Write a protein that binds this ligand. Structure first.
Ligand SMILES: Cc1cc2nc3c(=O)[nH]c(=O)nc-3n(C[C@H](O)[C@H](O)[C@H](O)COP(=O)(O)OP(=O)(O)OC[C@H]3O[C@@H](n4cnc5c(N)ncnc54)[C@H](O)[C@@H]3O)c2cc1C
Ligand SMILES: [Cl-]
Ligand SMILES: [Cl-]
Length: 491
């Protein structure tokens, strides 16, 4: 004989568009849905926010409910894959192990080791591509052996290849369950823990709930107005909108695979066929999935892509070791309310609009503080619920003019940028309530408010809210000079 399979979740935390799951179930007597949880992961070198970890746990709870509805259940195995799988292969009489391919660096090492162990145990391994739109190694190959290095050339490449594969069918309404009385499948050892049980001491504050069920609901909400979908232009959306965010907020769901990228793409093409004036890449909503695909393709084929040194696409720049500036930025006490409000949204929600990320990343790196993008990436990695190895690295290199982007004379203003969208400061007042009573005329520049106004607002600069840590005009002039010199050194 009979077929006993494992469907191993890592990303791809969904039942829809899951070719790995469909193969695991095919002709199977027993199917073991597995997630491998690392019970000491939170005891490391890298801190992880409860927001992101709890989003994962909610996503696993949703998978558990989906499998239970179909006569099965999710097995959250504790330990390391290379240690756990050899034992459960033999315990469960496994003949096939299926999982979605993952092109991240650690994934490649882990998966090579598991493939070796599967072969020793006589286990067939099936690893379909479905986290990305395309087989990104196929894209590189069709491009002549190297990844495109511009978004425009990347878009031309995928258009020559054609449409991404359609999303796979839904799985059957009933699934083969684990076998009975298998000790490694004992319910008490294989349940989804809570954030308290994994060791977090403060509760999650984010407003976006994990899981495939929420992902599909938010997909449908995005598609309730096909004219908005068709006309979407990313650079024209409003980073100060928080009650109704100006973009889809599907990124955490795409990061964890709660939402299929191929489903999203197929739904876009359906709308586009009915709206021939729809927006085109890069600014379109399909363009956004292509930004993701572009950075996955370059990132996966570039050594040390998430670092500066040893990264062949990355400019070597003489960033300052300035821990005081990094700390003020990380801790949302720069004294620029637009910046501090965005950094507070980072820690509270784990998600900000793309141009809000632009504002704070420019400020930290080539715009004002001249701190390395690697340090900014680490702070984002701790807190983002959509934290994505390749996307975070690529966008930090873009924003610091280290790769892909080189126009270091374009510097966002930490005062003016948000005011053009939100002159009343509704976003600032939401995330920085200490400023909730500051007249709009001063809310982006509270240090300019008369002391009488600061006192009446209950927000005295230097006491209740810090003074700005730099003069933007002075800081940006200095950073631009350093960037120019760094570019000349790389000649
Ligand atoms: C400094 C910095 C760090 C970032 N770190 C991350 C990260 O860790 N994870 C992440 O998913 N995105 C990251 N982004 C990209 C982008 O800001 C987010 O993808 C976007 O804000 C997610 O919101 P949304 O789902 O509403 O996007 P939409 O505009 O609705 O786009 C739909 C989907 O397309 C993808 N996408 C959109 N914009 C980009 C982009 N610029 N690059 C790559 N893919 C994109 C995402 O999967 C997103 O969910 C970063 C950007 C910057 C400037
Ligand atoms: Cl764009
Ligand atoms: Cl600006």
């Amino acid at each position: 004989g009979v077929k006993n399979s494992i469907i191993w979740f890592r990303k791809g935390l969904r039942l829809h568009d899951n070719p790995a799951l469909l193969e695991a179930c095919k002709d199977a007597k027993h199917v073991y849905p597995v997630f491998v949880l690392d019970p000491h992961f939170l005891q490391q070198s890298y801190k992880v926010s409860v927001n992101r970890y709890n989003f994962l746990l909610e996503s696993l709870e949703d998978l558990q409910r989906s499998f239970q509805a179909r006569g099965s259940r999710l097995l959250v195995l504790r330990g390391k894959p290379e240690e756990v799988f050899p034992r459960v292969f033999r315990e469960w009489g496994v003949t096939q192990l299926c999982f979605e391919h993952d092109t991240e660096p650690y994934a490649k090492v882990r998966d090579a080791a598991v493939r070796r162990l599967a072969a020793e145990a006589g286990v067939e391994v099936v690893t379909p591509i479905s986290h990305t739109l395309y087989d990104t190694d196929m894209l590189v190959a069709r491009n002549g052996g190297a990844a495109p290095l511009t978004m425009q050339s990347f878009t031309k490449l995928v258009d020559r290849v054609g449409d991404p594969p359609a999303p796979a069918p839904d799985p059957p309404a009933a699934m083969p369950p684990p076998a009975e009385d298998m000790p490694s499948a004992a319910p008490a050892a294989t349940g989804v823990p809570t954030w308290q049980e994994v060791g977090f001491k403060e509760p999650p504050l984010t407003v976006f709930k994990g899981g495939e069920t929420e992902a599909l609901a938010r997909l449908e909400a995005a598609f309730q107005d096909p004219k908005w979908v068709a006309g979407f232009q990313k650079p024209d959306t409003d980073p100060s909108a928080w009650e109704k965010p100006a973009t889809t907020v599907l990124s955490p769901y795409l990061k964890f695979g709660c939402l299929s990228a191929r489903l999203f793409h197929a739904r876009l093409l359906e709308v586009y066929r009915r709206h021939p004036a729809h927006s085109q890449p890069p600014v379109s909503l399909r363009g956004q999935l292509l930004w993701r695909e572009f950075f996955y393709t370059v990132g996966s084929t570039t050594p040390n892509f998430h670092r500066m040194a040893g990264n062949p696409v990355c400019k070597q720049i003489d960033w300052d070791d300035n821990p005081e500036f990094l700390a003020a930025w990380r801790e949302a006490r720069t004294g620029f309310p637009w910046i501090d409000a965005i950094m507070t949204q980072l820690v509270t929600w784990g998600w900000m609009h793309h141009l809000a990320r632009h504002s704070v990343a420019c400020f930290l790196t080539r715009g004002d503080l001249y701190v390395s993008w690697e340090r900014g990436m680490e702070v984002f990695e701790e807190h983002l619920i959509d934290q994505d190895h390749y996307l975070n690295a690529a966008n930090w290199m873009w924003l610091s003019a280290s790769a892909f982007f080189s126009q270091y004379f374009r510097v966002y203003s930490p005062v003016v940028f948000g005011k053009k969208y939100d002159p009343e400061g509704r976003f600032i007042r939401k995330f920085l309530p200490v400023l909730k009573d500051m007249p709009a005329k001063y809310i982006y520049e509270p240090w300019t408010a008369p002391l009488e106004v600061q006192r009446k607002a209950g927000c005295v600069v230097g006491r209740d809210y810090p003074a700005p840590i730099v003069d933007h005009a002075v800081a940006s002039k200095a950073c631009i000079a350093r960037m120019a010199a760094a570019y000349r050194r790389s000649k």
